[PDB]
Structures are given as structure tokens and as C-alpha cells.
Scaffold this active site. Structure first.
Site, short mmCIF file in Angstrom:
data_model
loop_
_atom_site.label_atom_id
_atom_site.label_comp_id
_atom_site.label_asym_id
_atom_site.label_seq_id
_atom_site.Cartn_x
_atom_site.Cartn_y
_atom_site.Cartn_z
N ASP A 5 -74.36 51.74 -48.45
CA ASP A 5 -74.26 50.99 -49.70
C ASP A 5 -73.63 49.63 -49.47
OD1 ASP A 5 -74.14 50.15 -52.31
OD2 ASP A 5 -72.56 51.56 -52.92
N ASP A 13 -70.34 55.54 -59.32
CA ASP A 13 -70.46 54.16 -59.84
C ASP A 13 -69.55 54.04 -61.07
OD1 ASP A 13 -72.06 51.47 -59.94
OD2 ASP A 13 -72.48 52.42 -61.87
N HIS A 69 -76.37 53.98 -51.83
CA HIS A 69 -75.57 54.02 -53.06
C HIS A 69 -75.75 55.33 -53.82
CE1 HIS A 69 -73.30 52.38 -56.38
NE2 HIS A 69 -74.30 52.59 -57.22
#
Lengths: 303, 288, 305, 287
Positions: free
Chosen positions: D234, D125, D262
Site C-alpha cells: 500500500d 482505512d 491496501h
């Protein structure tokens, strides 16, 4: 009075964090029944061509309007207010901090200053708080500046409801850490560069200490439903008042679907659609707002 | 001209699948310049206490109003129109199926039948289509019935923008299902054909910004007309945010908030809708 | 083969009365390739031009899409443009697959029968993969790439392309019957509904009557051709150093800026034009304003040689 | 300032009994960096190991996320994992911007104070861009990249990322395939000052200039060995983002985890470790 006099001390004894170079106006204070309110009163000594009262949102205060006050005091009387709990106003332990009561403090303010034929500038909660005068004193209102605000109960719109519920649940952390200025204000702006660090310092410093009122505002989005209903049911009392509607098109809080509701209401209104501007229109657009106001402050005058 | 006879034949030579238990109405067809429309015209011999024009959405058709028609034809004249492209109306090669052209065909329909002081019933795109006739002929409209629709340009609204810009052929009904399977088939059977109209409508939400502005900027033609607003509160397409815009507009109006009801108010609320209309018709009748 | 070419040529002159030759003044020409007779235009100087251009179209478009480029680039450059089999005025053979992987073979057969060299390729939509499936194994014969709302990789895991491809897969039999491609799919490709003129709209609608088997197989192939699309992507390094001009309609719902960033990472030598307020059909919606964006490339290409 | 941070070092022992040290069996360490004190893992063999790994988390995750890698690799590889300011047991200074571009400067400071060498970066991320920054301007000292569900470009024209930023929130809470045991170990550290959790979703747009300052000079990175591990379920980082990394790197390998979402280092857990260790040896032959 003694509450008023202690705020008058704090303006000197404590408030030296203020940046007077951008906020040069005179701090004045009056002891209204609910508590001692800080306010500003600037203009020509004959009172100018028209009188303005400027009503703010969460977690803002009168510092929001400095761009208008410096520039319109050329010919108009700018009056600007801090609600109780906000800015440099008193933080009374015993006040409700409810919007439906701020509107009563605002009426008491207007009556004690005896302001007349007043034009109301309303941002955020300042709209409802202003409409809670123009609904029932419309003959004492000259016109309205309407910015990213509303006048209806939103409890069935899951947009506002889920945001209100979210901040209700998180409120204690938001009041402990001032997540209203530190987080909610940044997401209001469309341009992360336009919210200046000097402004950020001032809005943060102004909301130090107790900040209970900043936490109650998002609760009141739902908690005040009946008061908002009482405004909307009498909207007809405002539809003849002229208004200029100035709106940040990038605001996700108040969408164009809010605008269409205002644009439907007024029989005589003009709309300025500020693309690339978010919720805090008077801060993000700043000096660029002033001509959009002045154009209205003349257009009222020839009727 | 023969195209008119061809649509008349299609009703009974071909469209034998229509559920004539719940849709008992006599089918009629009229040859407008843009194509042959199919319509309902059911009522007492008198012409009734009122004449109602009922305008459907996308991808619905006059089968949407069967609950009103069967119960109001007791005393009122009920007229309901299948848009070109929809129901048993012609699916002309030539037509734009853009709302601004449906509105003209709607004016042409009202004038060719000569309907008078009509009450407009509108859902979804039947709103703007109907509001056009009330914007420019407010003399000939008795009142408005306003179910889940709108009358403003929305191109800045991400919510409506997403719905137009999304890749599709055309708007299928559904997006715990809210319809009887009988009803869902009676719609499915009508979408089998030239689906074109079902795809233009979701585009025109942006494609016709000018036309929606040409209504919105002269909304005061309508604001004095009596209107009753009936909202499916569970809808996500037309939020209560759109409801307040109507409540702000009309001077003489009443709002009914149907909780537990979604987009297709005439289907989901069904035969319970009829009393909400009768209450309004006998209010409009005291203005003439 | 000459009989199949002659059938097309006769059908051009006898049946293609519908063509608006005022906006399509180019000379119609025809090649009898192995799978069928393609229709093409070859416009430019009487010598070979400063550079040679081949322009490859999308669905349900045809070389009429490139009219605005040919009209204003034939001044110095050889503008070649081609109608796929099943499209425009080309032959519609009953036994051809109309598969995109097979169009790339017919384009290869076309290129090598005309003997085009140091070619610059213009690719819109499916025309991208169809042209990339030449540049990726003939890169030294390719001068450069013009990239417009297209891709070169399998998308079977992206719900975006998948459900669109699957929805058209289901509806195909109706869309091939009533031509919802030109009547519905094309209009949603525009950011200004007016800019798709009623003349052009008529032209595309007239051109795609009769057999349109290719129009409905093209969206199926978005998933059905995953093997072929994969074969390109795994060999992307054969395209990575060809210069590319990327002209992208930012309002396109089909090919997002997410796709665009993939080309910007791929190409060692590239530049991007971000056409805000323009949708999928860049050469329609941007009209002749496109032409300078092309000419800028052809100049700064020629600096190499 | 370091000795005031000796109080930060001690402040753990007030409360961090709450940390599940049975699944986070690590010696906590902390450095008084200039922007604020940070808490970090540095677990590995005394011999310094085969590689040094720096592991950079997302929002609202923290170095607990990488516990499977640290636990299973620290026998032979030096595993360094860091809590961002505002997250985990790192300081929550009121004066900090919590903007990504400034986190990257703290990471650069952190690396230099420890003096880490030819480091492999592991990034999820926001830990992507934050790591990619150091790989833009010190790629000599980067040994390789491990890429999970992330990006490196300005997305302010992308409708999908725009919606996520402009949506009204306090801060990004995680959300069901976590254990409640793990879920609460996030939610626990999510108590207290959560400012940074609400800045990140805005900075997706508000830091477009910094994301441009990565994307424009991406060619500094394209020759660094990379392995891309993608949670295919995701909705945030689609396969559409994956292709752009397969286009960027020359020396790279893609692993597509179907049925993983995710939070790849949670939802795949210890099964991630072989995918990394393969890459650690593959990179070691560049010494």
C-alpha cells in the site's frame, strides 16, 4: 416580457427560502432575449463614485457577493447577477447554458442597463465571461478584479483536462444529486469551518430544481475551447486595463502558475496572495475582502 | 593561471572519449575569474549573419546543441558554453554553482569575448541564466529562443517544491527512453566527476527565490525583445501552464508547440529544430 | 594507547589551525579509547553542573554543530560533546568499521570511561540510534532524551529511506572523493539556504577533508544495519518511560512527521516542538534560538530529583 | 421514524437482486437510527458465540469487504458488519454531514441500540478512526482491536496525505488484483448518491480537530489488546504509519503481508481468517 413577470412572481411566490437578514438587497428582474435574469442593483442614488458588476462561478450565484454589496453600496454601485439556470434566475428549457452564451447574456445585460466605465469583478467562469466584454469593449471598462480564474485554452494541461473529463463522465449523477454544492464546494474551501451552515443551506436551496447549467460548466472547460482561444488570442486588448488580482493560494484548481500568466499579461496590476484561502475567495474571506476591493475602487478614480 | 592550461590539456590528454563524429567542433577554453570555461565557437570567418549564444540545462552540456551548431555554422556564428561543473569546463572547488553566480560568469563570458547583439538559446536553467543577461543588458541581445524553462519564483508551487525537496545526490537525466544509447553515454561520461553542480541546481529552485524575484519583478526589460518559444508538450516539468506565462509576457513572439516531444527539445527534436531557428534568425536580421 | 592520543593532540595543535576558535572557544580534549582516540569537549561549572549533557551528532556533522548549545548551557550544566571516530578532529583509524552499531559501542566505552551519570542525551540524525543504543540498556543511568530529526527502527520496507540509501551506496566512491556530503547533502537539509552560514559551511568542509570513510558508510548503514536497528526497536520499552523533549524541523525531507508520530506514541512522558520552516539540521538552522527549548527541559527534569 | 424505515427495510427488495448473495449469503438487517437508517450484517450462532466482532469498512468499500470473515467465523463468533450512511444499502439522507466525526456518533448509537458487549473492533482505512473513537471513550466495552492500513492522528502537515486530499475529484473510486466479479459488486453500490465518497478525502484535513481529539487521548487505547495486519505494498498507509501503532500498543502483535496492497480483506481474502481467529482466542483469555 411575460418570462420576466413570472420570475418577478417567483421572487415572492416561491423564494421565501432566502435569508434576507444576510441578503437584504432588492431582487430585480429583466427579460433579456435569452431569458429572464435575476439581478441586484444597489448603491448611492447618484450612482456612486464608480459602478461595479460582479460575475460568479459554478455552482455559485449572486449570494457569493453579498459581503461586497452590503459594504460598498456606501459609495459605489454594486450590480450582481445570476446567470440563467442559477440562483433565482429563470431556468429556461431551451437555453444552451454555455459560457460563450452567458457572456452574450452578460453583454445584453450591460447594454440594457447601460452600465458605463464599469469595473468587472470576476470569479471562476465569471472571469472569461467578464473578459468576453473587456476584450471588445475595453473603453467601457474601468478595471478588473481577478480571482481564481483564467483566460486561455487548457486542453493540453492534463490538470484541468482530467478534472473536466471526470465531471463530464459523472455529470448525470452530479445533476441528479447536486454533488456540485454538496461535494465540489467543500473541497474548494481551505477551512472546513469557514463555509458556514447558513451559507451551505442557501447555496443548496438556490441550486434545487433543475440544475442542468451546473453540469454543463465543467464540460465547457474543454467543450468551449475555441471560445477561450478567441479570448486569449486578443489578450492584448486587456493588458492596458488596470486590475487587482486577489487569489486563494490553497486553491488546487487555479494554481500560482495561472497567476503568473495574469501577472505577465497586465502592464498595470497588483496582486493579493491570500494564503490559507481556497477557491471561493469571496465566501471564505468574506468581509475581509472588502478593503482589498475599495483600495482598487479609489486607485482607478484618479486617472 | 596554470589551471587554464590544465583544462586545455584535459580536453586532449584525457577527454578522448568525446564522439568527434557528431561533435566535430574545435574545443576552446577561456580563463574567467570564477574558473576556466570550455566553449564552442564555430562559424564563418565573417562572424556570420548572427552570433548565437546557446545555454544548456542540468545535467546537459554543449553536446545538447551539436545539431544546431553543425547546421547553423553554415552562415551564423554559434557559441555554446559549458557551465563550470559541467561538460569539459573546470569543476572549481571554490564556486557556489548557484544560478545567480553562473549568470555573473555568463556576463563575464559574453564581455570577455565581446559578443554583440547576441541571440540567446536557452533550455531549463539556461533560461533564467540567459534571461539575467537580457534583463540587465537588453541593449546587447538580438532575440530569445525559449525552450522548456521559466522566469518566476515558484516556492508556492507544490509541483516545483516536490522536485527541489526530494532527496537526491543530483539530477540524473531521466525521471521507451527518449535518447539514443550513444547520447546517454556521452552524457554519462560527463557526469562522471565532481557531480556537485547537478545537485545545487534542483535546490536553487527554492534556494534562489530572491534571484528569481529579481528577474520576475523587472520582466518588462525583456518583454519588447523578439522571442520564439518552442515547447516540448509532453514534458511534465515545464507544463503548458508555464507556456502561457511566456505567451502573456512578450509583445513580439511566436509559439511552436511540439507534440510528441518531451523535456529535451534539442535532443528529441534534434536536427529538425534547425529550420525553426533559421526562420527566426532571418526574422531578427531584418531588425538590423 | 598514549601514543595514539598524543598523535591526535599534536595534530590538534599543529594541524587544526583551521578551527574558527571565535565561535568554537571550547577546550579541545582527547580520550584514547580502545578502537581509537576520540576528540571531545567538556564544558560547564568547575563543580559537576546541575545536570550532565552528552550531545551526539549526525552525518557529516561534528561537535561544532552543538557550539550554540555549549556556549549558552555551560552556565549551569555540564555540556559534554563528542566527535565520532572518522569525524571532526577525532582519529581516523584504517581498521575501524565506522558502523553505527560500532559507534554506539565507542560511545558506551566513552561514557563509562568518563563515568557520566544520570546523563541527558541529545541525539541528532544517526546520533539518535547511537544514543538510544545506550539508553535502551542503561536506562536508569539516563535522565532524559533530546530528540531531533532521528529514528530508532528498521526502514528497509520504506521506499523513502531505501532508495536514498541505495543511491548513496552506489555513488559513495565519488561522494567520498569530492565530499558531496558537505557540499550537496548538507545544503538540502536547510529550509533557508542563507541560514547555513558561509563560515559554518567552510568549517564543515574543512573538518571532513582527508579520510572520510565514515561519511559514506553512514547512508549505507540505513539499510545495512537493519539487524542492529531492529534490536533497538524490539526493546523500545526500555526507553518508553524516559522523559523526552522532541524538537523537529518540519521541513525535513529525510525524517518526516510520520517518524515524529512514532516517538509521540512511544514516550509515556514527552513534549514536542514543531519547528515549521526549519529543515534537518535543527542546531544549525535554529542556532541559539534552540537554547531555551533545551533549558526548559533541564529545569522541569530536575523537579524529579 | 422506525416505521418510515420499515420502508427502508423493504426498499432492498426493489433492486438488491443485483447483490451476489452466493458470496454474500447473509440475512440483511436494518435499524432506524436517528441520523438515518443503516443496513448491517449480524451473523452468528444463536448461543451468542465466543466473541462479538464489529467490522468497520473504508471508503469506497462497504460491508461486502468483510464477507470472508463473516462467512468463515459465524459458526462460532458473532459477526456484526455495518454499512455507513451513504454506502452499501444504508440510507443516503440529504441532510447528513457525511463527516467522519458524525459517522462515529452513528456507530456509537448503533452499538447501543444493539447493546453489543466487550466487542472486538475490526477496522480498515476510515474504519480505523471511526472505531478508535469508540475505543477512546468506551474502552470498557471494547474487547480488542484488529488494525489494517489506517491511522489515528492529524496529518495536515504530512505532504503525502495533503496531496491526496487536495487533488481534484468527485469521489474516491477504488483504484488490478480484484476479480471483476468483486470489483463490480463495489462499483454497483458506488452508483447513486456518492456524496460521502467525496467528503472523506477532504476530511483527512478538514477533520484535523477530530483526529486531534483521538491522538491527544490515545492513552485510553494503548492497553487494549491489538493485532495489526498490514498490506505492505500500500502507498497510502506506509510502514511509516505501522511503526506508530507498534509504538502505541503494549499488548499487540504485528503481521506484515508482503505482496498485499491496501484492500487487505480483498487481496488476502479467506487467508485473513486464521490471523483473526488466533487473535479471537488470544483475547478470550481476558474474560
Amino acid at each position: 416580457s411575460n418570462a420576466r413577470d413570472e420570475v418577478i412572481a417567483a421572487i415572492h411566490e416561491e423564494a421565501d427560502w432566502v435569508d434576507r437578514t444576510v441578503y437584504p438587497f432588492e431582487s430585480r428582474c429583466i427579460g433579456l432575449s435569452s431569458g429572464a435574469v435575476h439581478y441586484i442593483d444597489e448603491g448611492p442614488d447618484d450612482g456612486g463614485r464608480e459602478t461595479l458588476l460582479m460575475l460568479h462561478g459554478n455552482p455559485t450565484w449572486s449570494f457569493l457577493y453579498r459581503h461586497l454589496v452590503r459594504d460598498l453600496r456606501d459609495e459605489y454601485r454594486c450590480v450582481a447577477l445570476d446567470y440563467l439556470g442559477f440562483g433565482l434566475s429563470e431556468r429556461p428549457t431551451d437555453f444552451s447554458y454555455r459560457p460563450e452564451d452567458h457572456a452574450d447574456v452578460v453583454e445584453e445585460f450591460i447594454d440594457e442597463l447601460g452600465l458605463e466605465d464599469v469595473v468587472l469583478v470576476g470569479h471562476d467562469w465569471g472571469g472569461p465571461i467578464g473578459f468576453s466584454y473587456a476584450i471588445d469593449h475595453p473603453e467601457n471598462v474601468g478595471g478588473l478584479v481577478v480571482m481564481n480564474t483564467w483566460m486561455w485554452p487548457v486542453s493540453d494541461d492534463k490538470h484541468f483536462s482530467r478534472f473536466s473529463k471526470l465531471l463530464r463522465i459523472g455529470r448525470e449523477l452530479c445533476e441528479r444529486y447536486d454533488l456540485f454544492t454538496r461535494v465540489i464546494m467543500p473541497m474548494g474551501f481551505a477551512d472546513r469551518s469557514r463555509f458556514t451552515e447558513s451559507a451551505r443551506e442557501q447555496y443548496r436551496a438556490a441550486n434545487r430544481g433543475d440544475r442542468t447549467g451546473t453540469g454543463i460548466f465543467p464540460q465547457a472547460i474543454l467543450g468551449s475551447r475555441a471560445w477561450l482561444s478567441s479570448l486569449w488570442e486578443q489578450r492584448d486588448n486587456i493588458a492596458d486595463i488596470p486590475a487587482r488580482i486577489i487569489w486563494g493560494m490553497e486553491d488546487s484548481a487555479f494554481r500560482p502558475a495561472e497567476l503568473r500568466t495574469f501577472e505577465a499579461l497586465f502592464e498595470d496590476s497588483s496582486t493579493v496572495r491570500l494564503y490559507g484561502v481556497g477557491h471561493y475567495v469571496p465566501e471564505e474571506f468574506g468581509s475581509d475582502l472588502v478593503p482589498l476591493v475599495r483600495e482598487f475602487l479609489e486607485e482607478v478614480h484618479h486617472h
